[PDB]
Amino acid sequence: IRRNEKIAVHCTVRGAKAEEILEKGLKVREYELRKNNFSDTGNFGFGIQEHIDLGIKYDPSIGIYGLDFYVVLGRPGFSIADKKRRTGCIGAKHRISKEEAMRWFQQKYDGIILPGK
Amino acid sequence: TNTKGKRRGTRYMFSRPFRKHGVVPLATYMRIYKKGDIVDIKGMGTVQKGMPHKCYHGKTGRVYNVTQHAVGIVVNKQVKGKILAKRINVRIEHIKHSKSRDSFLKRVKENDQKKKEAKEKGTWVQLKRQPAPPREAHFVRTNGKEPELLEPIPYEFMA
Amino acid sequence: GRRPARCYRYCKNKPYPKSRFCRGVPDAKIRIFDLGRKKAKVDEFPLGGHMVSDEYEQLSSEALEAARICANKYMVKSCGRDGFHMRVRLHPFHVIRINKMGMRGAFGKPQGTVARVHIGQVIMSIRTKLQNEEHVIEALRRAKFKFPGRQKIHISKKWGFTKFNADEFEDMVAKKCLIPDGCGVKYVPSHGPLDKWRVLHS
Amino acid sequence: VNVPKTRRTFCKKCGKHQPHKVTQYKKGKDSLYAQGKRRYDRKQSGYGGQTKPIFRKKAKTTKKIVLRLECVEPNCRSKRMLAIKRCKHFELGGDKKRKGQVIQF
RNA sequence: CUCAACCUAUUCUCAAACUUUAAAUGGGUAAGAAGCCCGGCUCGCUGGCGUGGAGCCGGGCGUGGAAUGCGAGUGCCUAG
RNA sequence: GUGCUCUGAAUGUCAAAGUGAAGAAAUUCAAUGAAGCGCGGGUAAACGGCGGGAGUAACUAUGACUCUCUUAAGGUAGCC
RNA sequence: GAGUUUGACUGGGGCGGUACACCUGUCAAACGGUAACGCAGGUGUCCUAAGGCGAGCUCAGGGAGGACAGAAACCUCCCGUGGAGCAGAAGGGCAAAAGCUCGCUUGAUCUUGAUUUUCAGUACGAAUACAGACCGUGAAAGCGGGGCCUCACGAUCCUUCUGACCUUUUGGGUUUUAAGCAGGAGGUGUCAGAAAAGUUACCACAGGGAUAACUGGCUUGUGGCGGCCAAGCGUUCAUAGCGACGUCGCUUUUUGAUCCUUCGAUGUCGGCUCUUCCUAUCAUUGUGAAGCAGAAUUCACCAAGCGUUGGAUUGUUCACCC
RNA sequence: GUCUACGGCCAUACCACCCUGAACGCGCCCGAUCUCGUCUGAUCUCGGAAGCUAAGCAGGGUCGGGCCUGGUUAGUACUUGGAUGGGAGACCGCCUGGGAAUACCGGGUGCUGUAGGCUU
Numbered sequence A: 001i002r003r004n005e006k007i008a009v010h011c012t013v014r015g016a017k018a019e020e021i022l023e024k025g026l027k028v029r030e031y032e033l034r035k036n037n038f039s040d041t042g043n044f045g046f047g048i049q050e051h052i053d054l055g056i057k058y059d060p061s062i063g064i065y066g067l068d069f070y071v072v073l074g075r076p077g078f079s080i081a082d083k084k085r086r087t088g089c090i091g092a093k094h095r096i097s098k099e100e101a102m103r104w105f106q107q108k109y110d111g112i113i114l115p116g117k
Numbered sequence B: 001t002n003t004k005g006k007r008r009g010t011r012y013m014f015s016r017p018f019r020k021h022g023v024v025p026l027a028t029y030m031r032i033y034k035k036g037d038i039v040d041i042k043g044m045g046t047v048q049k050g051m052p053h054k055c056y057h058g059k060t061g062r063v064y065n066v067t068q069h070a071v072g073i074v075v076n077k078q079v080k081g082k083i084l085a086k087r088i089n090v091r092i093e094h095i096k097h098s099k100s101r102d103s104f105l106k107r108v109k110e111n112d113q114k115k116k117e118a119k120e121k122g123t124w125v126q127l128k129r130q131p132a133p134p135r136e137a138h139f140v141r142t143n144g145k146e147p148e149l150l151e152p153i154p155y156e157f158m159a
Numbered sequence C: 001g002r003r004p005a006r007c008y009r010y011c012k013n014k015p016y017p018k019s020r021f022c023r024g025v026p027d028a029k030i031r032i033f034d035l036g037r038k039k040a041k042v043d044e045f046p047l048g049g050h051m052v053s054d055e056y057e058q059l060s061s062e063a064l065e066a067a068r069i070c071a072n073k074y075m076v077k078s079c080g081r082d083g084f085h086m087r088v089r090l091h092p093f094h095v096i097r098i099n100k101m102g103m104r105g106a107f108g109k110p111q112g113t114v115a116r117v118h119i120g121q122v123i124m125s126i127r128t129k130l131q132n133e134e135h136v137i138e139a140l141r142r143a144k145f146k147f148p149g150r151q152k153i154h155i156s157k158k159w160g161f162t163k164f165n166a167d168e169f170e171d172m173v174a175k176k177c178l179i180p181d182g183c184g185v186k187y188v189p190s191h192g193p194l195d196k197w198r199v200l201h202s
Numbered sequence D: 001v002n003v004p005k006t007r008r009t010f011c012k013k014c015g016k017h018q019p020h021k022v023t024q025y026k027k028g029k030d031s032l033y034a035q036g037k038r039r040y041d042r043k044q045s046g047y048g049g050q051t052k053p054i055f056r057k058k059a060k061t062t063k064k065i066v067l068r069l070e071c072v073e074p075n076c077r078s079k080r081m082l083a084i085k086r087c088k089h090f091e092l093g094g095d096k097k098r099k100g101q102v103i104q105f
Numbered sequence E: 001c002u003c004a005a006c007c008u009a010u011u012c013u014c015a016a017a018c019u020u021u022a023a024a025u026g027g028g029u030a031a032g033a034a035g036c037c038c039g040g041c042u043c044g045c046u047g048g049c050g051u052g053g054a055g056c057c058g059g060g061c062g063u064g065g066a067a068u069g070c071g072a073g074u075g076c077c078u079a080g
Numbered sequence F: 001g002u003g004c005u006c007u008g009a010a011u012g013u014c015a016a017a018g019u020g021a022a023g024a025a026a027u028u029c030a031a032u033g034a035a036g037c038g039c040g041g042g043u044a045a046a047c048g049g050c051g052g053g054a055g056u057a058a059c060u061a062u063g064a065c066u067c068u069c070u071u072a073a074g075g076u077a078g079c080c
Numbered sequence G: 001g002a003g004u005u006u007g008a009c010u011g012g013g014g015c016g017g018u019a020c021a022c023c024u025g026u027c028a029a030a031c032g033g034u035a036a037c038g039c040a041g042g043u044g045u046c047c048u049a050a051g052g053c054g055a056g057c058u059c060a061g062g063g064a065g066g067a068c069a070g071a072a073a074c075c076u077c078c079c080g081u082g083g084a085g086c087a088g089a090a091g092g093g094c095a096a097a098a099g100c101u102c103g104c105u106u107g108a109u110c111u112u113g114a115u116u117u118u119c120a121g122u123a124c125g126a127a128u129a130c131a132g133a134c135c136g137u138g139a140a141a142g143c144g145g146g147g148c149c150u151c152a153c154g155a156u157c158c159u160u161c162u163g164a165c166c167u168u169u170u171g172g173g174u175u176u177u178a179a180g181c182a183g184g185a186g187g188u189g190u191c192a193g194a195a196a197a198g199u200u201a202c203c204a205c206a207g208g209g210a211u212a213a214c215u216g217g218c219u220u221g222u223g224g225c226g227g228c229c230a231a232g233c234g235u236u237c238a239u240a241g242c243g244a245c246g247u248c249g250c251u252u253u254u255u256g257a258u259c260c261u262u263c264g265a266u267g268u269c270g271g272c273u274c275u276u277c278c279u280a281u282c283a284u285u286g287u288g289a290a291g292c293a294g295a296a297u298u299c300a301c302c303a304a305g306c307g308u309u310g311g312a313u314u315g316u317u318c319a320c321c322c
Numbered sequence H: 001g002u003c004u005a006c007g008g009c010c011a012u013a014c015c016a017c018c019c020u021g022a023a024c025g026c027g028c029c030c031g032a033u034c035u036c037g038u039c040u041g042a043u044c045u046c047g048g049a050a051g052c053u054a055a056g057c058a059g060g061g062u063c064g065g066g067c068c069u070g071g072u073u074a075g076u077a078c079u080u081g082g083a084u085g086g087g088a089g090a091c092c093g094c095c096u097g098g099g100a101a102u103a104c105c106g107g108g109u110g111c112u113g114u115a116g117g118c119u120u
């Protein structure tokens, strides 16, 4: 690859559309992402190797592309980090740890962390 | 040997003090300067416009002209065997006032009020200042105790 | 080959280290500055003896290596192999120049490095037990024979290679103001965190 | 350098910023009846050889580039010389450079 | 676990073209009547304003506002 | 290569004069094209000039032999 | 055939370099200034944006994750005082910047003076404050007459172009032409700016010890000759004899370095001849030591009284052999 | 006793973690019809007011790190001027004046301007 080309296509999705598309991705993952996809800042993500499984029907012109999901997770009051006027940092006990990220995931999607290995 | 560039040798004098970089504080911009008053010339290096020459850094002149952002100053410069008054246009980030002339003016006003009070009250009071007289014979109490005996120490080699 | 050291004995040329501006400098002859049993802790070797200059001059790395070698050999065949630790306290950072074998374009080229020593300055130090003191003094004298100037042999009032005196040393150790680690010691001031005092003082 | 074939600057005749078309000034050909040329021919006639210096050193490698600006107004179409710094390669109205394009394979 | 890398707290020794700090000696300016303080007038500059700034016309204030020493200023011509 | 010399044919460049055109004229432009130069041959008892690197034979060494970049020729017969 | 030229600086000239016009750091001794063929480097450019505004962002680096993807491809979060970038040398400066990304533009325009820098307080170049126009940008305050600052460049004369319903073109008038006035450009890099190849052993003149080629003098790197320490050698044994790594000296019989004396002249290699001196002693006198049995030899001491040769080859000093 | 808005000096104000916050306020927060911007009303812009101090913010704390200010280092290092001082030199002592900087040991940790609020 050489610089200033075009390599990736990405998109940012938030809200009800985000939770339902995340619901579809975990339906593909059968609500199982195993050990260490959770970053230490309380975010996580995974990859999907083929998109047609869920959702949209395959189109013969469109390829067979895979993709990856990164959910960055928050808490009400996190917008002070990107507020323009009187910006601040969010505070120590308002952060998201790996433990509470896993706890929220399995409480909201009754999923399974820590498989047999 | 060396060049005749305009900032030769100004590695340290046109630099900022340690942990004093960045934004220039605004009081230096909102000072006022009337034509006739005494200003020090330093010449910070955050501002590159209107900056004085290195011969005028650390000098003192009086203002003869005020413009939008700068001031014309009359400074004495010593060329080889004469002193002559140069007229330089320097900016207000590079100048500041003179507390020497300020102190002189406040002791002028003190002298004037003192002469007025002396004239109305009918006395004669001292107005000049005198250079640190000798030391006015006095007694030194020992407070009963004997002065401590001091004595040079022996030599020991540490370092 | 190498000039006689009397051509470069005196400090007169405005310290000249190898840097960006001085390139192509050969390696100094002294590469090992510590010798003997360097892992004895603090109290295996309580006695320290220094060899300290009394002249302002520069010593060559060749002379430093020669003195280190002969002092090491005398200490080895006198106090045993693991009975001492010596550090030379002088690194040859000043580069000396040579002009080529008239005076046009005469700025020389780097041929060696010397260490500039001051009047009160330690050249070498040996730490050993308290009963090998005469052996330390003899080793430092026989190493003193390898230098141009005048040097003095002096036993320090301090414990080994530390900066604390031998009389107040064990009391500081017992009251835990001075914690041993490695060849030296750490000083514990009473103004850290109390949780640090709690993982200590216990 | 690369300067565009038109710009908008002061026109002294109308005392006003105006569009000017920009060409490159070329030195004209000699008059043969200019007074220095007349004096030079008068001096060079007869015997005596070369009577003025001939330079023959040529230290410079570039020239200052002069732009002829013409005011586009149909009534006042006055001209004006305008000079820029030295340049080896001069371009008159080339293609503008852009910052995002894939440069280069 | 032996060794590493790495990290952390220490330790030995340095810098004309490094530096937080930082002298001694040094460079400039000030130490009054061309100053001080009252009135009034002019302005096409400045302006919320009787503004601000500058200039000008009057008036009154001498304890001559550190030490020490000393008469100064000023022009032409000019050799080596 | 530098000289010297020969060929001139269609042939590039090439001064004065002459010719045509524009203009009111000074003047300008165009066509016309001598020698020379350029282009093409010759000439060294003209001036002069006349190469490197590898590996290759039953001890070893060399290199008849080969492979190589290579210039206008790569120093021949002799001689040291 | 004629006339002329054939730079300068220079640890003599030449050769080599440019220290010849400039810029950064150092030297440089805390104002400024400050030399050397001092040190470390750069310049004769580059840029319609890399100039001018406005807006919005944050950089290098690291950590943790995410299909292919691993040390490196792209996405996300956190830490990140700048450790990045700002055309280039270096120094300074700079973070809702001066960096990066967009939007709009041409203040890189037309003018008079003042000032600073080098400085003689001349010029050029570069720069700084204003003032008068016409504009750009931004909601605006403002900012902008090139490049964030310190370098990036050039007189007279001549040529060329631009401007003035301009002046003159000689007795008047018209029209070409020419001259003039103002502002750019064509260049002098020896960069305050001749137009310039050698050789002289056939040489010349004015000079120069301001300056080389001897001696002498300072120095002693180099040469030569000594000393101190003792790791080793010496079958053993540091020191009979030696002495590695180091280090202290002396000498002026080597060669350098320097340029003080001498260029209105100190005769310039070697040999021959002849005298005298030195000692750092080869022999001989008197001794001490030995790894001194004798003989031979080696190491020291007092010691320069006395002697130290004949030849081959080479101009040789040196050398080598009989 | 405090807070908002705009500040001045620009860490005694920063950084790390912990506790408390009455009332106004400042925020977090709800939404995208209009204005205006995005891949995404997350940011920016607009329209609100159900809930909340969780966070920002404020105050306090830490034998806290930094920073500020003293002591020590130390009349040490260095230095002005002087000598027919010493020393073979290298350098050193003295006379006359000036006089630092680490390591180590204390104390402190935002003052304050203009305008407008709350606190019975």
Ligand SMILES: [Mg+2]
Pocket: B001, B002
């Ligand atoms: Mg210099």
Ligand SMILES: [Mg+2]
Pocket: B001, B002, B003
């Ligand atoms: Mg320089």
Ligand SMILES: [Mg+2]
Pocket: none
């Ligand atoms: Mg500028």
Ligand SMILES: [Mg+2]
Pocket: C012, C013
């Ligand atoms: Mg020197």
Ligand SMILES: [Mg+2]
Pocket: none
């Ligand atoms: Mg012809």
Ligand SMILES: [Mg+2]
Pocket: none
């Ligand atoms: Mg032939």
Ligand SMILES: [Mg+2]
Pocket: none
């Ligand atoms: Mg042959």
Ligand SMILES: [Mg+2]
Pocket: F080
């Ligand atoms: Mg031969």
Ligand SMILES: [Mg+2]
Pocket: none
């Ligand atoms: Mg200076």
Ligand SMILES: [Mg+2]
Pocket: G029
């Ligand atoms: Mg000075």
Ligand SMILES: [Mg+2]
Pocket: none
């Ligand atoms: Mg901005």
Ligand SMILES: [Mg+2]
Pocket: none
């Ligand atoms: Mg405007």
Ligand SMILES: [Mg+2]
Pocket: none
């Ligand atoms: Mg203007």
Ligand SMILES: [Mg+2]
Pocket: none
């Ligand atoms: Mg003319």
Ligand SMILES: [Mg+2]
Pocket: none
């Ligand atoms: Mg010149």
Ligand SMILES: [Mg+2]
Pocket: G209, G259
């Ligand atoms: Mg002389």
